[PDB]
Amino acid sequence: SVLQVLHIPDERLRKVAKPVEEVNAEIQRIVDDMFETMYAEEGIGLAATQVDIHQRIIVIDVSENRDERLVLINPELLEKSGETGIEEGCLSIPEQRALVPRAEKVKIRALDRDGKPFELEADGLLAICIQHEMDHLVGKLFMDYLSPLKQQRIRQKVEKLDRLKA
């Protein structure tokens, strides 16, 4: 079932998510609810913190056909290198996009939907998405990489955008 995505400014988006102790039926229902919400909003990734669930869970689908589910429970970054960037957007910061510096390659370790560990070497868009989604778990948003002036602008814009759309 579709979940509600928080928008800035909401301090809840800055809470550091806790590690999942045991992947089970409940965790799995959350995983499914997250995919449903992500696909519904046409996003390519979604961190649990965005839907107000403070546990280290991320769902991703960077495919064109939109049928290639990637689940990262308790992700852990092992290596990262190179430099790249794209005009990132976020469901929590409606209508704003900004070029954010990211590592081009990134190797991680995580648990899948069944709680089994795997390691993944990613590059291109998938690498970027992972970095974006992982930042979400530690309360970091993509706007924090910009100059304070730009950050303030963004807050004013979303703040306004939301109030008018209510």
Ligand X SMILES: CCCC[C@H](OP(=O)(O)O)C(=O)N[C@@H](CC(C)C)C(=O)Nc1ccc([N+](=O)[O-])cc1
The binding site for ligand X (CB under 6 A) comprises 41-47, 86-92, 125, 128-129, 132-133, 136
Q: Is the CB of 66 or the CB of 116 nearer to ligand X?
A: 66
Q: After which residues is the chain broken (C to N over 2.5 A)?
A: none
**Distance in angstroms (rounded) separating the CA atoms of residues 53 and 8:** 16
Residue span binding Co ion (CB under 5 A) among the ranges 52-60, 63-71, 73-81, 82-90:
82-90
* DSSP, residue by residue, 68-126: --EEEEEEEEEEEE--EEEEE--TTSTT--EEEEE-SEEEEEEE-TTS-EEEEEEEHHH
CA-based max dimension of the chain? 45
Tokens of 111: 């648990």
Closest to Co ion by CB, 31 vs 44, is 44
CB–CB of 100/135 below 8 Å?
Answer: no
Binds 42: which of Co ion, ligand X, none (CB < 5-8 Å by kind)? ligand X
Report the partner that residue 75 touches, choosing among ligand X, Co ion, none (CB closer than 5 to 8 A by kind): none
Q: Is 119 a catalytic residue?
A: no
Interface of this chain with Co ion, residues 88 to 147, rule: CB under 5 A:
90
Q: Which of 41, 42, 95, 133 is catalytic?
A: 133
Q: Which does 44 bind (CB under 5 to 8 A by kind): ligand X, Co ion, none?
A: ligand X
Binding residues: 90, 132, 136
As annotated, the active-site residues are 133
